[PDB]
């Protein structure tokens, strides 16, 4: 918008865990307005992750999430006839949305059987610094260091 | 296991593996299994040979094999040299049941030509 200073629509927390972060995650994962199916996928995969990675249900989700959050991105700006990838620091809230969006999109392009099994394995090896989701973060950081001259 | 369709089904559920027979679909196969008192969940394996034997004569009550291909072809060949409208459609390779030919008749006319 040219002038509007938009507010922020509220989001209800998780029913089970009361988490304001998993409500966003369910929204990211859901499709075609089927909220219940997404909650079933996220819950089943989360508990599978908890028992695989020991204990500590939702902070097992945090430990993988903290391994994929970008800290600097690139913005394409056209100069006068050439364009540069100026690297800009990422806002706090944008860091989560980027980290969640990458995990979900990577948790779709796998050969596993279900979506719960598909997503849990991504959430696991991301905590172990493996997987396409963490590679995306590495690629973005590598791209943003090559243009550090333009910061 | 060879059945009256002398083709050979395989290790799937009974109600689906029967569908491998030309001329037997989904409901007809259910009717066949019902007349032999076989559950639709059992695979084609773990069937006693007598069970298969009583299956394969139940299929005999339908005209379902290359014999069925025979009458299908004869019905079309009849329309062919009879000369009726559907004979002309069948000989020219165009749609027969009054569909649209100005555009969009690909599955009958084949791939695109220049």
């Amino acid at each position: 918008p040219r002038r509007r200073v938009i507010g922020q629509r509220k989001i209800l927390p998780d029913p089970k865990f009361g988490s304001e972060l998993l409500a966003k995650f369910v929204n990211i994962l859901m499709v075609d307005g089927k909220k219940s199916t997404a909650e079933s996928i996220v819950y089943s995969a989360l508990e599978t992750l908890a028992q695989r990675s020991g204990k500590s249900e939702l902070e097992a989700f945090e430990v993988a999430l903290e391994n994929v959050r970008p800290t600097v991105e690139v913005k394409s700006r056209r100069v006068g006839g050439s364009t540069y990838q100026v690297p800009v620091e990422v806002r706090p809230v944008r860091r989560n949305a980027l980290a969640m969006r990458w995990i979900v999109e990577a948790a779709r392009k796998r050969g596993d059987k279900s979506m719960a099994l598909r997503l849990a394995n991504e959430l696991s090896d991301a905590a172990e610094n493996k997987g396409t989701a963490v590679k995306k973060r590495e690629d973005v950081h590598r791209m943003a260091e090559a243009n550090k001259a333009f910061a | 296991a060879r059945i009256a369709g002398i083709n050979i089904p395989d290790h799937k559920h009974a109600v689906i593996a029967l569908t491998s027979i030309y001329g037997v679909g989904k409901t007809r196969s259910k009717a066949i299994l019902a007349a032999a008192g076989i559950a639709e969940d059992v695979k084609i394996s773990e069937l006693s040979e007598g069970q298969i034997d009583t299956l394969r004569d139940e299929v005999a009550k339908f005209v379902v094999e290359g014999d069925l291909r025979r009458e299908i072809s004869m019905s079309i060949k009849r329309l062919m040299d009879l000369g009726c409208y559907r004979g002309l459609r069948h000989r020219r390779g165009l749609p027969v049941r009054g569909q649209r030919t100005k555009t969009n008749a690909r599955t009958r006319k084949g791939p695109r030509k220049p």
């Binding site: - | 009849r78 009879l82 000369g83 009726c84 409208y85 559907r86 002309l88």
Partner: protein, 82 residues
């Protein structure tokens, strides 16, 4: 498909066919009723069916029974595009 509660033939042709059977075989019986089905009484007759602008002649045989008269008289002419 019409019902099993009767096939359909028009009167003005049913009279002509039954009047022409006994008098033998003659010049083709000219008609416009493309929509009338073919009866076993018609076998061996020659009927000139309308196709919009001519009366194309069809010689009825045993296998063309139950078919409408029209489908032995195409109304469109098509010979290729190039």
């Amino acid at each position: 498909r019409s019902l099993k509660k009767g096939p359909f033939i028009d009167l003005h042709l049913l009279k002509k066919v039954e009047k022409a059977v006994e008098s033998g075989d003659k010049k083709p019986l000219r008609t416009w009723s493309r929509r009338s089905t073919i009866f076993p009484n018609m076998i061996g007759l020659t009927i000139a069916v309308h196709n919009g602008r001519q009366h194309v002649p069809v010689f009825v045989t045993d296998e063309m029974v139950g078919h409408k008269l029209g489908e032995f008289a195409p109304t469109r002419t098509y010979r290729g595009h190039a």
